[PDB]
Design a protein around this nucleic acid. Structure first.
Ligand SMILES: [Mg+2]
Ligand SMILES: [Zn+2]
Ligand SMILES: [Zn+2]
Ligand SMILES: [Zn+2]
Ligand SMILES: [Zn+2]
Lengths: 98, 98, 35, 115, 526, 44, 65, 77, 192, 254, 240
RNA sequence: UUUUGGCAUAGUUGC
């Protein structure tokens, strides 16, 4: 029930601790075009946090060359915070250093 | 038995793993559907990737809004255990102190 | 032996086609969940 | 849902006059012909025919709105020649022209088919 | 690096950074790092030779895949932290050729620069010929176009779906679109668009459309709504059941006719319905029995496409009813190029009224000239020219961003070879008078997208409707109804006008008129 | 009422009282049959 | 989805030419040669066959009801 | 002993016309001869031009006093 | 109404031919850009050899930055002037700009001649990488294209580095649009 | 103050199109004829569809919309028909409509193409034009499509399926002697097929006394009517409209 | 808590007293229409048939409103309600009783919004007086509001998907107030910068720049065709 | 014989 609840609501953390639970992690998959579905599946989110208060994360940084699409960000109050992977970008899955 | 884990579609434990296009059409599943999402109560839910600061790395900033000239933090985190990550600041006091 | 400049335009897109035949587009999600 | 039925651009609903004549008081010998359920098909051709009449001082037409199927034709003639008479003469000339063109087109088809 | 390139003890995704000036070697193996593959350059030469390309051409029936390129030590994954220590060639054919030396120590080379773009930015033809906010805007709109969102849409029952009747692959395409499956699931139509001022209904980013083209199915579409409903039995106090209810066994029902429903409380697929009609007749027992049947959205109208019945996770019988509504394009519906040229249908003209070339080719769409100069979507114009060239040549044009083999001068020469003006302009005739237009109109095919924002889903009006239960003010019912908030800014506007009576009318007797009794001695209510 | 099984296409009658299940496959998805009321379209 | 009956612009019949078009492509015609062989001069008509995607073939893989 | 402007203000014109149109809509006697007039607002504007509206505007100065102006007394601008 | 009905006879359009210039104009623009880049190189090598002396009230970095900025602005204005002089009276782009209906002269110059310098926070593109704007440049490169000077027109198409730097530039305008929408009427709603 | 004496010269006549030239006529008359070709020549097209059974992948409205665009041989039968709403019948009759029936059951292991050949009319003179054939839909095994339809008289102004033409090429003054269009660089523009200029010339000299005449037509038929029949019915219909307007004007004057 | 019920944007004060939902309001997308005067607004037939205005029954309008009553709410233009003098309300969707369709003077009839009705028209965010102005209703047969192009500048609107709101004043007093204070012609010149807010925009501005060039000449047919579209023309063709 | 209704959290999207 906890996994089902967390993926159903997108609130992450304990259900009783929804006050401190990061929200919107899990979203309903977008089905308007194939491109919309693909872009939703390859989406990255920048939480606001305390870090957002320190350095301006909205503006496009040079290190996003080849990793993140430079010209795909949602307009409005989420500009530059929600991003999309570049086509050949691939996220390391992690292995053991031993 | 201890619970039920949701399965991301077309992952290596989904029943659609490694099936031909004819088989996917036999199951009324689009062969171009990339998967990569869960089904929770029939609703197709996608987990958005969340960016955060990398761990176990020394980062030296200069807090413009404090009595510290510089602060060297390190969000130290164990090797895939104890998700509470202990962050430690090592800060040089500003010379304009009392 | 070496890829000539005129043939390079075909060659690079052959490489990228082989990539997307191998990994696909949602490799991040599937690999992370498999791990 | 507000889309009009497509037939309300050539069909007269009941209680609608096809053509209505109104005297224009600004200038003597001037009339406005409001024709319902017509478009540039008849407006432009009637205006062009009327312009060939020497006794017509002014001949113009307008569609007041593309979504409304009225055409207003303003005709002003010399003060010995009613605008209504000019309008009738223009239509008769156009009908004679089109009948002649039908006849010559049939003859041309027969000659081309025969060789 | 030798070991990682050989897929030895070090796996490919491990990243190794040498901070030379600070005397550090940092090796990262954890997850979450983002990397991309780069061709390896050694001694100003690629390690990718023709033999690899030959083996990859016959990728089928050889099993020489991408993983064998990685195993060959020809291409390797590089992350941003390691990109800091990388001298990268944008392209082999020029950057590492001999020259007046700029850099002679390249370590990697880009596969193709166009792979910096994402999914929705990779469907833009000639994005390097646009102002970048227009590329951002197209990245936003391409998610909202109409197409065929999935092949098995017939069996699915999504809450909302839009399916375009006749999608087409773009006549002017990118190589990246080959791998997005966009050729197989397109979203939009190649439309003969003319950039011309006309009767005046395309101004300010509006669009005139060809009515006769729409009559031939141009941009026609379908909108599917699935309504789910589950009866539940909580012990025995309440028992919801599907059945067509009657006035003589229920204590409250709508005047909407229940004869649509069969005698299980379910309407059949193929029945025409409207916004008030009942689609699932459900009734709950009274502790006679009150109904709790469900109706259509009040604005909507359609034909019941499909009616499925199952048992839920609990085991209670529950059904899902997909209703089909055919959306013809009309005045108000959105359309967009792949360049941020958003715009609503201003007016629809029949074929005889549209302007026409000397060949009888009327435009499907007329867009205003003034949409171009401030926006500087030159990629739109180049797409139109390339579309004309490709449609005449019997070829699919290529519009990858960074491709010097494609040049507007070459496209102009190719177009001149087909007996057209080299810049795409044409002598158009006025549809009404038949006269030649004094200027020569730029015209040609262009890929347009019908966005999901139809007017019929956005139109509503309120007058004396269902107020709130607490506030006694208008409320958003099962629709867009419930009035519009006459917010603070509107009140300040009307104060600036001095329209005090109108301001009172809006804020008092048009929302919640009321009266009370107050004692004159004690000012508390009585 | 007649329902069509979603896996083996068997038209089977079901009352408003019994749980739905295909009577030769056990499948638990059923589709209502197309209406027999006349439906007419203009071809526009 | 399926080939439109009419060209959207000029209203020429183009629905009876998809199968022949594919047949000519199996005869190793260039796509321009195939469109010329089918007598499609105006690029409005040529756009129809040249950019059509026959998705109905993919839809006939699923079982009927 | 009046100090307010002799010109009817825009707001005075607006309220006078609205009020008089409401009165005429309520079958009030009309103070001007009308021909082919049915909308109360046109009749009210005809009365205003005729200066035959039977209304007195009470303008409150910002000291708790007032001035009463017959509508015919004010200049219809 | 009157002028919209006359425009059915006149007609008004915009096409590729309204963005083409004469070959002489392209050669003049390319010569201007060659010269401007070579002067930027002269300023760079004079700074590297310590032969550049700071202006009063500015450090050597601010002096150098103002020098390259004024060189590139001079180049952009000269290219825009030459592009505007090449325009014919029939150029629909000019016909729209002259009436004030849409666009302006800078848009003509950007479409035809040179997009120009990209700026984030009002300065050239910063060294986001370690002493680099991108990994395709050498370290400590203050050349124009290295620091985000787009030398192509929108007609000619931007190079990959130029495309990314232009995206960086436009992201700022998007962010300011969002911030204005955030501050739309807040000052007003307190003032009222 | 009277009519022109227009003259016709047919330059080409095939079963697909007629190409001809009209001289000694006003531009307005020529454009009105060109416009009547598209919008006012009545033909027969499917406009009433009852679907008794559909199992195809395409929903019912898709099939009906595709059936409407099927062109029908309406060469001579259209003249003796009446508009349905004008007809006094109980909604349908052989004097205002033509019945069609389609019944195709794909009971085989190959994709069955439901083409225009499967449309069966109750009148032999009104068939699908292709009767290679126009594809209506494709059917899988066990998919039935069974419907009846009626095709009625109408013209393209109401809906584009009654449009008989497949593109009406229209031209005048191919060398631009009148300068109704102003080329910024006349050298760049290819000659019209009707141009009489040598290749060293780009534009005829300006004619201050010129007037548009010698209008070049190329009327391509979709197939419902022969192009000869399209033009003749167009002229007849425009004459009929003008005579009806004459009748109404005479009534209004009286 | 009771504090949170009043605090903030959504409390009773700022959410339900300084601004609130209102009846007799409609919203939809806007499309251009150069054939409307600047003070007119196109309205779909559905919105007009849905929204209503109270006409007081007067012997000048007794027969007209009786006809509107007999048409009922089912048909446009029509009426929804009859408010008799007692305050009782007769709903003209459900009462074929002819006795209830009698109209004595002083009754009110909530007739459908017909042509020429005054409506306040607004686009949010509302930033100045010219963002809410009075228009005359014109019924047009599609599902969008229509504006003259010149008024797109005061509203800061463009037909790229923008929606606009339409409020109908519901009594002759407020209707006269809007007619005399907030109509579009009265809002041409702003007091902000003592200048016009509406101007000639886009196609018309480029076309007038082309038109008033020294070397534009018009044949007589063109001149007469253009003078058809001149509402203030005195009918006299000027000397060439 | 003339009805009426969840709400208040989060997300997404439009200008
Ligand atoms: Mg807008
Ligand atoms: Zn008291
Ligand atoms: Zn079964
Ligand atoms: Zn065509
Ligand atoms: Zn009949």
């Amino acid at each position: 029930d906890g996994l089902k609840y967390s993926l159903a609501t997108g609130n992450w953390g304990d259900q009783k601790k929804a006050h401190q639970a990061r929200a919107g992690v899990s979203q309903v998959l977008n089905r308007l075009t194939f491109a919309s579905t693909l872009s939703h599946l390859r989406r990255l989110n920048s939480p606001i946090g305390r870090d957002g208060k320190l350095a301006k994360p909205r503006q496009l940084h040079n290190t996003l060359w080849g990793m993140v699409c430079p010209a795909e960000t949602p307009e409005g109050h989420a500009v530059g915070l929600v991003k999309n992977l570049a086509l050949m970008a691939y996220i390391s899955v992690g292995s053991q250093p031993s | 038995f201890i619970g039920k884990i949701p399965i991301m579609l077309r992952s290596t434990y989904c029943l659609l793993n490694g099936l031909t296009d004819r088989d996917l059409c036999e199951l009324n599943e689009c062969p171009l559907d990339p998967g990569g999402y869960f089904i929770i109560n029939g609703s197709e839910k996608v987990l958005i990737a969340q960016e955060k600061m990398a761990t176990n790395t020394v980062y030296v900033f200069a807090k413009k809004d404090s009595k510290y000239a510089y602060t060297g933090e390190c969000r130290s985190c164990l090797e895939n255990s104890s998700r509470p990550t202990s962050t430690i600041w090592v800060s040089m006091l500003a010379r304009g102190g009392q | 032996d070496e890829i000539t400049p005129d043939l390079w335009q075909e060659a690079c897109w052959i490489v990228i086609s082989s990539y997307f035949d191998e990994k696909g587009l949602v490799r991040q999600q599937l690999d992370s969940f498999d791990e | 849902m507000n889309a009009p039925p497509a037939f309300e651009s050539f069909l007269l609903f009941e209680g609608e006059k096809k053509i209505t004549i109104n005297k224009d008081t600004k200038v003597p010998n001037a009339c406005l012909f409001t024709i319902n359920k017509e478009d540039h098909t008849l407006g432009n051709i009637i205006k062009s025919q009327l312009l060939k009449d020497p006794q017509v001082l002014f001949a113009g037409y307008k569609v007041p709105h593309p979504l409304e199927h009225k055409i207003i034709i303003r005709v002003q003639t010399t003060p010995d020649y009613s605008p209504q008479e000019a309008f009738t003469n223009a239509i008769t000339d156009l009908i004679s022209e089109l009948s002649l063109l039908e006849e010559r087109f049939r003859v041309a088809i027969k000659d081309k088919q025969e060789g | 690096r030798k070991l990682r390139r050989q897929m030895d003890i070090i796996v490919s995704e491990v990243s190794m950074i040498r901070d030379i000036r600070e005397r550090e070697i940092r090796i990262y193996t954890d997850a979450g790092r983002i990397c991309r593959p780069l061709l390896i350059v050694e001694k100003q030469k690629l390690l990718l030779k023709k033999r690899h390309i030959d083996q990859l051409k016959e990728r089928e029936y050889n099993n020489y895949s991408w993983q064998d390129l990685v195993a060959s030590g020809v291409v390797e994954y590089i992350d941003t932290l390691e990109e800091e220590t990388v001298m990268l060639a944008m392209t082999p054919d020029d950057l590492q050729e001999k020259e007046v030396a700029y850099c002679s120590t390249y370590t990697h080379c880009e596969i193709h620069p166009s792979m910096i773009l994402g999914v929705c930015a990779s469907i833009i033809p000639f994005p390097d010929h646009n102002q970048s906010p227009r590329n951002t805007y197209q990245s936003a709109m391409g998610k909202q176009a109409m197409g065929v969102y999935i092949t098995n849409f017939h069996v699915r029952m999504d809450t909302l779906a839009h399916v375009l009747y006749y999608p087409q692959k773009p006549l002017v395409t990118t190589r990246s679109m080959e791998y997005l499956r966009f050729r197989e699931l397109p979203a939009g139509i190649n439309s003969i668009v003319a950039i011309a001022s006309y009767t005046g209904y395309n101004q300010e980013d509006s669009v005139i459309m060809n009515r006769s083209a729409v009559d031939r199915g141009f941009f026609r579409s379908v909108f599917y709504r699935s309504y789910k409903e589950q009866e539940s039995k909580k012990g025995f106090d309440q028992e919801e059941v599907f059945e067509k209810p009657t006035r003589e066994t229920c204590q409250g029902m709508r005047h909407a006719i229940y004869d649509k429903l069969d005698d299980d409380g379910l309407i059949a697929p193929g029945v025409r319905v409207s916004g008030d009609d009942v689609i699932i007749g459900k009734t709950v027992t009274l502790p006679t029995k009150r109904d709790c049947s469900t109706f259509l959205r009040t604005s909507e109208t359609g034909i019941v496409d499909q009616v499925m019945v199952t048992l839920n996770q609990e085991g209670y019988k529950f059904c899902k009813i997909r209703v089909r509504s055919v959306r013809i394009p009309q005045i108000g519906d959105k359309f967009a190029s792949r360049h941020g040229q958003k715009g609503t249908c201003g007016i629809q003209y029949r074929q005889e009224d549209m302007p026409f070339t000397c060949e009888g080719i009327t435009p499907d769409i007329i867009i205003n000239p003034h949409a171009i100069p401030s926006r500087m979507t030159i990629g739109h114009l180049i797409e139109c020219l390339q579309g004309k060239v490709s449609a005449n040549k019997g070829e699919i044009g290529d519009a990858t961003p960074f491709n010097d083999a494609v040049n507007v001068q070459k496209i102009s020469n190719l177009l001149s070879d087909y007996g057209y003006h080299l810049r795409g302009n044409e002598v158009l005739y006025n549809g009404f008078t038949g006269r030649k237009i004094t200027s020569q109109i730029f015209i040609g095919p262009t890929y347009y997208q019908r966005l999901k924002h139809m007017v019929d889903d956005k139109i509503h009006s309120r007058a004396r409707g269902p107020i709130q239960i607490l506030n006694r003010q208008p409320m958003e019912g099962r629709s867009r109804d419930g009035g519009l908030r006459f917010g603070e800014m509107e009140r300040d506007c009307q104060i600036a006008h001095g329209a005090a009576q109108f301001l009172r009318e809006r804020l008092f007797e048009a929302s919640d008129p009321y009266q009370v009794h107050v004692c004159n001695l004690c000012g508390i209510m009585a | 009422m007649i329902y069509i099984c979603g896996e083996c296409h068997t038209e089977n009658e079901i009352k408003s009282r019994d749980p739905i299940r295909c009577r030769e496959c056990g499948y638990r998805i059923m589709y209502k049959k197309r209406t027999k009321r006349l439906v007419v379209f203009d071809a526009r | 989805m399926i080939i439109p009956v009419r060209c959207f612009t000029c209203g020429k019949i183009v629905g009876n030419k998809w199968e022949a078009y594919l047949g000519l492509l199996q005869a190793e015609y260039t796509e321009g040669d195939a469109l010329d062989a089918l007598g499609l001069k105006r690029y409005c008509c040529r756009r129809m066959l040249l950019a059509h995607v026959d998705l109905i073939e993919k839809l006939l893989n699923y079982a009927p009801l | 002993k009046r100090i307010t402007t002799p010109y009817m203000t825009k707001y005075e014109r607006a309220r006078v016309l609205g009020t008089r149109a409401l009165q005429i809509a309520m079958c009030a006697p009309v103070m001007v001869e009308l021909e082919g007039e049915t909308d109360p607002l046109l009749i009210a504007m005809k009365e205003l031009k005729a200066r035959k509206i039977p209304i007195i505007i009470r303008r409150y100065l910002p000291d708790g006093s007032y001035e009463d102006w017959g509508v015919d007394e004010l200049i219809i601008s | 109404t009157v002028i919209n009905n006359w425009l059915l006879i006149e007609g008004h359009t915009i096409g590729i031919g309204d963005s083409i210039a004469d070959s002489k104009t392209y050669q003049d623009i390319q010569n201007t850009i060659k010269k401007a880049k070579q002067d930027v190189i002269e300023v760079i090598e004079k700074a590297h050899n310590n032969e550049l002396e700071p202006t009063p009230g500015n450090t050597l970095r601010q002096t150098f930055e103002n020098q390259v900025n004024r060189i590139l602005n001079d180049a952009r204005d000269k290219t825009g002037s030459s592009a505007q002089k090449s325009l014919s009276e029939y150029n629909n782009f000019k016909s729209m700009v002259v009436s004030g209906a849409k666009g302006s002269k800078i848009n003509i110059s950007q479409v035809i001649a040179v997009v120009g310098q990209q700026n984030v926070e009002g300065k050239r593109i910063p060294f986001g990488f370690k002493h680099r704007t991108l990994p395709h440049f050498i370290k400590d490169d203050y050349g124009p294209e290295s620091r985000g000077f787009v030398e192509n027109s929108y007609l000619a198409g931007l190079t990959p580095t130029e495309f990314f730097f232009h995206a960086m530039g436009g992201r700022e305008g998007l962010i300011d649009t969002a911030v204005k929408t955030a501050e739309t009427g807040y000052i007003q709603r307190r003032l009222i | 103050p009277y009519a022109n004496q227009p003259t016709v010269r047919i330059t080409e006549l095939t079963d697909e199109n007629v190409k001809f030239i009209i001289e000694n006529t006003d531009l307005a008359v020529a454009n009105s004829i060109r416009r009547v070709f598209i919008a006012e020549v009545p033909i027969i097209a499917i406009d009433w569809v009852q679907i008794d059974a559909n199992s195809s992948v395409l929903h019912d409205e898709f099939i009906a919309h595709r059936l409407g665009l099927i062109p029908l041989t309406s060469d001579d039968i259209v003249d003796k028909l009446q508009y349905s709403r004008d007809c006094t019948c109980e909604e349908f009759c052989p004097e205002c409509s033509v019945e069609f029936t389609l019944d195709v059951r794909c009971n085989e292991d190959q994709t069955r193409h439901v083409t225009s050949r499967d449309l069966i009319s109750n009148s032999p003179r009104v068939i699908p034009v292709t009767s290679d054939d126009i594809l209506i839909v494709k059917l899988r095994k066990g998919q039935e499509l069974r419907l009846r339809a009626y095709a009625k008289k109408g013209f393209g102004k109401e809906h584009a399926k009654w449009n008989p033409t497949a593109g009406v090429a229209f031209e005048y003054d191919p060398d631009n002697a009148l300068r109704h269009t102003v080329y910024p660089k006349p050298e760049e523009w290819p000659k019209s097929e009707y141009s009489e200029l040598d290749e060293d010339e780009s534009q005829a000299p300006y004619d201050p006394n010129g007037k548009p005449e010698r209008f070049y037509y190329n009327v391509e038929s979709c197939g419902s009517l022969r192009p000869e029949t399209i033009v003749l019915s167009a002229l007849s219909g425009l004459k009929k409209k003008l005579s009806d307007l004459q009748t109404q004007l005479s009534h209004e004057i009286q | 808590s009771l504090k949170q019920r009043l605090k903030g944007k959504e409390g009773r004060v700022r959410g339900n007293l300084m601004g609130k939902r209102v009846d007799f309001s409609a919203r939809t997308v806007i499309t251009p229409d150069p054939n409307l005067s600047i003070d007119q607004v196109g309205v779909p037939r559905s919105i007009a048939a849905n929204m209503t205005f109270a006409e007081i029954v007067t012997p000048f309008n007794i027969d007209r409103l009786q006809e509107l009553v007999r048409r009922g709410n089912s048909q446009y233009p029509g009426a929804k309600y009859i408010i008799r003098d007692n305050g009782d309300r007769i709903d003209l969707r459900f009462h074929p009783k002819p006795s209830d369709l009698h109209l004595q003077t002083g009754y009110k009839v909530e007739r459908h919004m017909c042509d020429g009705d005054i409506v306040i028209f607004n686009r949010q965010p509302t930033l100045h007086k010219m963002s809410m102005m009075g228009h005359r209703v014109r019924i047009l047969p599609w599902s969008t509001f229509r504006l003259n192009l010149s008024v797109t500048t005061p509203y800061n609107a463009d037909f790229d998907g923008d929606e606009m709101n339409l409020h109908l004043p519901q009594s002759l007093e407020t209707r006269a107030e809007i007619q005399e204070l907030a109509m579009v012609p009265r809002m041409i010149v702003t007091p902000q910068s003592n200048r016009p807010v509406m101007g000639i925009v886009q196609d018309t501005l480029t076309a007038v720049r082309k038109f008033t060039k020294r070397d534009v000449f018009l044949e007589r047919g063109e001149v007469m065709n253009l003078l058809m579209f001149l509402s203030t023309w005195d009918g006299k063709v000027p000397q060439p």
